[PDB]
């Protein structure tokens, strides 16, 4: 649900432009809950992951 939507949105310029116009409308149409929408609107990435389920350093400066 949430995962499939994000995946498609990030790939489809058509849907992306649709999202830009009306985020809530598009999200609600893809069956995102109110809490999921709220998280998006408030930009609480943390919650988004919690509602979905479940280090990025690949280098150093010590030579």
């Amino acid at each position: 649900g949430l995962s499939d939507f994000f995946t498609q949105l990030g790939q489809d310029a058509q849907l992306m432009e649709d999202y830009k116009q009306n985020p809530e409308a598009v999200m609600r149409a893809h069956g995102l809950t109110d809490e999921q929408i709220n998280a998006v609107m408030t930009g609480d990435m943390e919650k988004l992951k919690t509602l979905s389920g479940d280090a990025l350093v690949i280098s150093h400066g010590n030579g």
Partner: protein, 262 residues
């Protein structure tokens, strides 16, 4: 067996190259290091046979040097290749930007007589220029690893856009911590005060990983950096401190001057 290292970018699903996506699809096995779980799911749908490199990072407040983590990563990758698997390494952003694993793997693979190459991807730097609408060519560009800029001798050009990567672990010398302290950041501030004033506006940038996510562009005086909220994916942008001054010496040799500049 062969090795192809690709980048997926920072955004989910959409910021990977067409060719790089195709490599993952037809790969026998994929070694992945992606930002989040959404990205991990996406990958698994492309190719089910995925091994997560994340597993080689310290587990449970364990004291582990990242140099060992990276070495374990490289070994795992090569193991697949040595077995005869058409191996693909999928790292977020550009696989060869502030990422040694890919370079190391390709190097070692070649030395053992295996086909190995790297496909370019969209790095956090690429995302920065676009999000902030800054051209690196405008007044030039400099990039340094934050800790290397403190441990070694680097002199920045204060007329260029300066990027200090891995600002989150700036001054973390052991390579076993995943964040530094405000005191370490204060020393860096003091060091930067050689070329940049304390009230010099800097920018903490964080490219979005999700299509519904807005990038982080936090502007603040250099002085407040030590008290700022930093994350591993945080990049510090230090804009020019001075403007471009003319170089009469060379202009003269060119036999021209400012008024002759088109």
């Amino acid at each position: 067996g062969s090795l192809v290292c690709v980048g997926t970018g920072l955004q989910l699903a959409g910021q990977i190259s067409v060719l790089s996506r195709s490599y993952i699809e037809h790969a026998d096995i994929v070694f992945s290091l992606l930002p989040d779980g959404f990205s991990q799911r996406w990958l698994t749908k492309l190719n089910p046979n995925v091994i997560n490199l994340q597993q080689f990072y310290a587990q449970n407040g364990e004291v582990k040097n990242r140099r060992d983590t990276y070495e374990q990563m490289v070994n795992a990758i090569l193991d697949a290749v040595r077995a005869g698997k058409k191996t693909v390494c999928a790292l977020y952003g550009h696989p060869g930007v502030f990422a040694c694993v890919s370079h190391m793997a390709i190097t070692r693979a070649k030395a053992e007589g295996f086909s190995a190459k790297m496909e370019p991807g969209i790095s956090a730097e690429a995302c920065l220029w676009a999000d902030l609408g800054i051209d690196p060519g405008n007044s030039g560009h400099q990039s340094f690893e934050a800790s290397q800029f403190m441990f070694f001798n680097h002199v920045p050009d204060p007329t260029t856009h300066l990027l200090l990567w891995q600002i989150a672990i700036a001054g973390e010398h052991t390579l076993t911590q995943f964040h530094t302290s405000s005191d370490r950041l204060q020393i860096l501030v003091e060091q930067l005060n050689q070329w940049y004033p304390l009230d010099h506006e800097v920018v903490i940038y964080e490219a979005a990983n999700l299509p519904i996510q807005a990038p982080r562009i936090e502007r603040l005086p250099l002085a407040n950096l030590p008290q700022a909220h930093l994350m591993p994916i945080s990049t510090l942008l230090i804009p020019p401190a001075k403007k471009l001054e003319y170089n009469y010496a060379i202009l003269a040799k060119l036999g021209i001057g400012p008024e002759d500049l088109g």
